[model samples]
Target chain A: SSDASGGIILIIAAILAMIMANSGATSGWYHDFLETPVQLRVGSLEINKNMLLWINDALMAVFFLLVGLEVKRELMQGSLASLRQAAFPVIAAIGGMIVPALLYLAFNYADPITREGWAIPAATDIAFALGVLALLGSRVPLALKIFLMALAIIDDLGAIIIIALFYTNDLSMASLGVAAVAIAVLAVLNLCGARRTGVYILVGVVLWTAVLKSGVHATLAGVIVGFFIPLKEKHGRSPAKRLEHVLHPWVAYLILPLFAFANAGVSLQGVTLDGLTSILPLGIIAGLLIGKPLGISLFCWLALRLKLAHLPEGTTYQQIMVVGILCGIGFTMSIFIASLAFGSVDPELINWAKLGILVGSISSAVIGYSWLRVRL
Target chain B: SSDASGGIILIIAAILAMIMANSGATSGWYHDFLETPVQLRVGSLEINKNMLLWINDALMAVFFLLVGLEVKRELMQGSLASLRQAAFPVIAAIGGMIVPALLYLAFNYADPITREGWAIPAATDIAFALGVLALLGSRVPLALKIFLMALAIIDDLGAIIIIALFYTNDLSMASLGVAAVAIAVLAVLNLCGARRTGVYILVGVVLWTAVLKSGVHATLAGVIVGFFIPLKEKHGRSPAKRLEHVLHPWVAYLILPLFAFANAGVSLQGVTLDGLTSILPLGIIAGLLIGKPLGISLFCWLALRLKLAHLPEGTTYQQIMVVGILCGIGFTMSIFIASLAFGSVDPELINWAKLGILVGSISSAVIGYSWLRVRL
Candidate 1:
């Protein structure tokens, strides 16, 4: 629950951005502020971007590193450790991602540029959903809470695949080769029994740089290096756990909120009623509000009917349905995906994306929270 | 010992820089890497710097925040809470700073260019000295540890003054007004019982940006914000303590090492025999090697002779002497000062200063560690 409140921090950051977006003088300043170009060079190599890109590309890599650490831990020893353990949530997670993306695609299919935001609403903020449930004291059954966590973790894995598959640029083969070498070096270090988190992180940074220049999403480096960090607790510690432990609070409390503040500040001045009604925002709303719950509940019911999985003890099908409803409350990861989805697209479209994410996340939370309060 | 190993991480980082500096291809690459320009702009405000300056100015502000947190705690409730408790370390620390600057000045008084480096060796690396002591294990007494810690805090306070007084480009009164207002707002928030670390850090970032534009060494913003963050734990947790606890490992294990790696690389190529013996390097070495211990011991002895202070319980004069000796190992803060001291000076002088810092720190570490190993 303490962890879930990290979402609340993100909300708090969104408020800062929203305040600027809704205002006049600060809105123009914010745009120019984030557009200030910065350059990095080492001999012949150079990479250039503005402030917003740094937050999205570089700082988000650290965010992904945290995600990678968690993902590795989950697969190695958590809910996804075995096929039997993973099947129910894994299937549900896949359906959740696919259905939302399809819903988003169906809405934006008319325009190629607007269609880039397909994965924006596929995410589920376990922190936020669980946090809301946590506030009800004894109302949330333990098994249901565990169920949501399992689902969220699997959903994360699905999102990672989506990003890897869809969100890269023109890959530089030479740079990609360099990245492979760096990653292999990291693997060697892992094989050599390196348990130090700093060592892994240092090499991870090297790999990240290579990947950054490789024309892929730089954040994949986080996921790659994260996988190589051993989760086995040799002498009661491992690089994976130590990194996750140290970085989680920071990622949750600081970086996520900072990202939200910077990226969420979408100017509303030029935005029309028609823009809000457009298929892009409409797609996101439909994906989160309709697609996510439909996908999750339907897939879960299918799994149970097929006898491949059944509900956890002490949790009913109705409660599972409530869990499905709660899955719609996507915030942090969804917003992040939105950034990747339309990072270099029209600047005006970026604002619409932010507007959509904020409205959709809030709508889901309200609808989901009230339902859980009454039904459960 | 865990605390003292602070230096080991720093040493490790310096080794990285040293290796790069020693290597032919890498040395040039490292220079270009650090010199790559970065810029931030918001409306009428803009700040531009290279990677090296970012590490020194921005990243090190986080370092100073940790120092400020610890310094505030020590002043409020630790060894320095009372005048009597603080007298020996305080007086000795003052002497330590003064003598080093004077010693450096004595060598560089005639050279208008080199005279700016007077503050280079006044700092003692708390991490290195403490780290060496930590390695020595249970053989080191608690009283002596506390004594060394008290002195380092004072030493850092001097570092603040030396940096603030000597380092600047050009002062802008209007921007400083912005910084002051931002800082005062932070103090008001603190007085209003704000306990959240995020609020302070958020505002702190804004203040840092403001001060950076104001022509002050931006790191001072950390100290200012640090002082305002409450030390009294409201829920057995305070923002100051929480910040220090969360940030300490990052500061010690990451930022310090990264800073050392970036800043410690010094080319050995273009050096003359006369340059090696030049007043600049000699003064820094002398300030560290001779001035540190002499100042510490003489002032400390004077305090005892005047019946102004007494030895900590269970600490022998011989043990205190080692603390004085160990104070000569001014690694982090000294190097930081060296940067401020000669930021615009010749590259040759910068190398000499770096050379002097390396030699002086190692010499002090060796002498102090060995003597303590033998004596205590």
Candidate 2:
């Protein structure tokens, strides 16, 4: 329900950005707007990046902070708090990731540049897929919807780890030392059970800056800070929950939309049918449309056969198959990873990645909805 | 109690900064740190200032935002809610501002440059002064303690106004237009009773940046946003109250102390006892030492004699005299004004101002405490 509204808002933002990027009068300004440089300095420390990177680096760090908060809560207290509740989705999610990535690598493994984007189609857009499901109303089983939700959450966790492991820049050990110290301080604060959000925020900022300088993907700093946020509540108050509550609407409404607007402005001038069918786009398309559902359904079947996990209550194999189809709707997170994989490489590479994402995600949504419409 | 801890933190930070500034090994690094340049650009918009200005401009805006929140709350629902209850502190605050300013001008009035420093000593440091009061324990009557608290809050409101009115830079109509639009958006959000803090923060940041570019002190933007924060509570939740509760400890313990560390590092090498008695320092010294107590006591005596407002319960004129003496311990705020007045002018002028603040504040604390000790 929360994500349903965000999904529509993101679609509208993406459409607007596309319009702005292609329009005769507004196109130049849109490109120029993303190039606007921003710099921050404290003492001898400096961070210099353009508007686009600033959004990705700073704003999306906030996004990942929220993501980390949710994941941590889920693991500790929510659905994933129990292994039985977690197993089915967790297996499905891992299958979802590995298959898409394998499909991508199969297409582009010979080319070093294109192969870097393997992680792009492995992730799912939770809001977008959830929004599509919400459109189906009570026709969808509640268990299936939550199954998809938990699966998407795991997919995001996988994406976060992928970014940290593969996408970081050259390491700066000096800055890493600073980041380590900040982490230690956060640990001490947690140990002391300090409840003040500002203290955490102040140190968290230092951690973000240090990690930013340390050549870690700055967004990982957000996740790190989120993990450290005190989950324990006294008298119905929790720092983690309070921050998540305060950050959610903003992240969902403002940050996500703004992000979509910034990143989704694909210039159509260079794109043609043949170009869209090239290796990069082809790999991503096959990954999402073919790999996603196949991998999820195959793994789930194996788990059931092995007696390792059970199907969610009141849900049939046919429903899980359709849910896997919807999981291929990987627009947002897919586009994000594509950018990270190709952002500093050639611009055309990212454009191809976007083309793949658009085609695959749209095809998945349409086919998945059609299949569900006939079944339910 | 909040102010008490903040005051000590600030004092320590200031002392540490001074040591860093004067130390053979750290002195060079300290000045270089403050000079570190920072820049931000969006489209054609750019803001370039060094580290010192960034702290004073941006970090202090957060400080002022908290101040604005407090002032608005007091005016709407707290001690200033009733005019009869507000009269004495309000009148005494005005007197505290006017007389010190008059005293500073009495010394600096002939020179155009020096006259800019007239408001330097007009403000009081609530935390530092309150910390002193807290040390006095319960011997200070509750009524008198509250009276001092109310007075310092009004004093801050006066300082904020003075900074906006007197310290603003040259105006830019284009930036002003953007600022106006931002203000309009905030107004609409308020009118719509938008409950989300992120929406407000998002627009509030735009307002702050636009105002920064518009040549108004950016800190005023903080105050403006503060005034617009929704005060209404539903089911034990109010945005204003939540933000205030969240921001208070940070503002007190971190922001204020960091501000002190940044601004209060006056190198003693440029100063002699003779320099402390020079025209600029003499004016500030006289303003705090003599004019502050004289002005506040005279105004309250006038107000009481005229039957306009009663003395706070259990407060004698002699006790009020001691409170006035304590009010003259204008450490943090007085130093802040001095920086604004002479930051870009001769460096010597600010150093002299700091020399005056150090002497004036310490003297007032000792005299005020001794007086209270004898009377109470």
Candidate 3:
């Protein structure tokens, strides 16, 4: 239930942010608001801060921590608890990833310069996908919902891998070695059953700094450490029990939403229909609208045909198709990757990529929601 | 329990994201990774998208929708159900908001251009607040926790109002009128006790579009429509029952975290000690680290001193001070406002503001956590 609600909110925030960023009034106002600092002092002690960093770095670490927990929890007891259960989603996730990368590569194959945006479609925004499902209510079977969720999680893992492997520009071996040493320390902590979250948290901070200096995405430290987190709890404690006891409410209600408000604003001015129709935009649209559904459906069909996996209980082909279509609503992960992909090459590509994502996602929601309304 | 877990994850994510964004190796990787778009096509259907837009607009909308649901639920039955219950947090929230604005203004008084970032400290991240409480375990009273939650929600309300009222650069009357019409229609639907969420959602989309066109923040549409949503259920239905049944997990796990990941990335290369001491950064740091805690503690003290309100059961001056320190962790809302506050004056200010927020929030977290560990 909370997941569904989160999904809905994410979609709304994304749309509003995009529209405002594109609008005429956004030119200077948006950026100005972000620069305003709120100062605080207590006698001799004080801190000065602007609004953006507070949300992005300091608050977002908490968000990634939650993602780590979720990933770990699922692997321990939820849908990812067993390889048999995880196989279908994992396979589908790989397909989902590969198809999008290939599609992006195709668009930029001729222009080596534009080849940078290859990873944009490899992501699946679980929030958007789940939100669309929530809108359909009970028309979608619960099992199907779980299946899609697992698939998305796997997709996220795949994206993380892509980010690690393909996204780096250059590497410093010394820093990398230091990062590895830090990770090894974390692994030892996990092996020793150190359930004191504070210890892990402190170590995580140091590890984050190491990886940050080493050339890896700092957020990945959360996930890597999360994987090494002891899933087997003490005595009567289960991983979920331990995790739920330690973590809840904070990640869901606060940290994540803050991240949304901070990152969602893009200046929407100078955006026109013509601008929206650029090659990059078109490429993005094709990747999400065409690639996601095709990739998901193809993988599902192949698995079923091979008797490697069966459809989720009570799910009809029509419903699955609708779910596949909803997968096209790739907002959050798509944009983040695009920022990484094209940030240096051309700032304008970022805007165009944003346009394509908006168009593709909105169209997916419209088409998916409408079709589900009729069919389900 | 899930709520608590969500909070934990968010805090972890925030820290991890921050560390990674600042890391050297990850910086180049992050930029390159975001450059590419993933695409797909099959027969007549097609979709393409970049990573950033997906994260920003589409994923974040889900986050807002969840917020809408929470606001509706809270108004219906939670701490905000009645004015008598809401007054403490509401008044306190106003104080919290005003003090920070005044503090920032004080720092920027001489320069009209630099004074724009006044609202950065007017936020209380509910997840971070609650997460800290979660960390405090049962040392804190349930009533105090509830009070804090309510206060933070009110804090968010105040921030939203500031965003809509103070942040806009221009207005579009025609679009505003259209948005009004859409809101009216939504109001009529609520009055008629329409149970189907579909109609409301459809109207909400149009309202968002109109608001987007109106030169108003489109996310505000979520709050307005959320306000009109009926708290009273039909016949035997209860508002909490519906909300709990529909929206709990989605908001807790998915929407919020996605928002965090999408928004939290900032290039940390340009930050320096000198830059941190600039007017923009100084004002922000002071406002958050000093003004927030001082205002909250002072107002709360005054309220208790006057017997207008009592200290939450089992809370001490020391503990309250610690809580106040945590309030200085103004991550999400602060950054959201920063975009609006500093969009005009200097492009570089955005980076400075982000740095300030980062330093301020981290200091708050370190101080608050350490103080609570010692005192509690």
For model 1, state the Cα shift of residue B282 in Å. 8.6
Model no. 1, DockQ: 0.14
Better of 1 and 2 by DockQ: 2
Q: List DockQ for all candidates.
A: 0.14, 0.43, 0.02
- Residues B1-376, candidate 2: write the lDDT tens digits: 4546666667799889889988868889889878765565544565656657767777768887888888888788866788877777787777767766676567556564454545666777887877787766676566777777776767766776766666545567777788889989989988988877657777878878877742226777888888898887863689999998888887788788888888788787644456435434445455444554444454445344436435465676556767877778677777776776667656565776776776777777877787777775
Residue A35 miss distance in model 3 (angstroms): 8.8
Model 3 lDDT tens row, A266-293: 5545555454354345555554445544
DockQ of candidate 2 relative to the true structure: 0.43
Off by over 4 Å in 2: A1-3, A36-49, A81-87, A138-140, A167-169, A213-216, A232-238, A269-315, B1-3, B37-48, B81-83, B213-216, B232-237, B269-315
Per-model lDDT = 0.68, 0.71, 0.60
List per-candidate RMSD values in Å. 5.7, 3.8, 16.7
For model 3, the stretches where C-alpha displacement exceeds 4 angstroms are A1-3, A19-26, A32-61, A112-117, A168-170, A213-216, A238-252, A274-297, A300-318, B1-376
Per-prediction TM-score, please? 0.75, 0.88, 0.47
Clashes of 1: 2
Tens digit of per-residue lDDT, candidate 1, span A1-376? 4745665666677778868866777777877677775555444455555567766677678777777777777677875677766677777666766666666677556664444536666677765777677766575567777767766656754675655776454567876787778888888888888776667777878777776642235777877777888888875867677778877778777776777777777666565556436434455444444554444455455435446444454666555666776677666666666666666655556565566655666666766677777764
Model 2: docking quality category: acceptable
lDDT score of residue A350 within candidate 3: 64
Q: Which ten residues in a row have the lowest lDDT in candidate 3 chain B?
A: B53-62
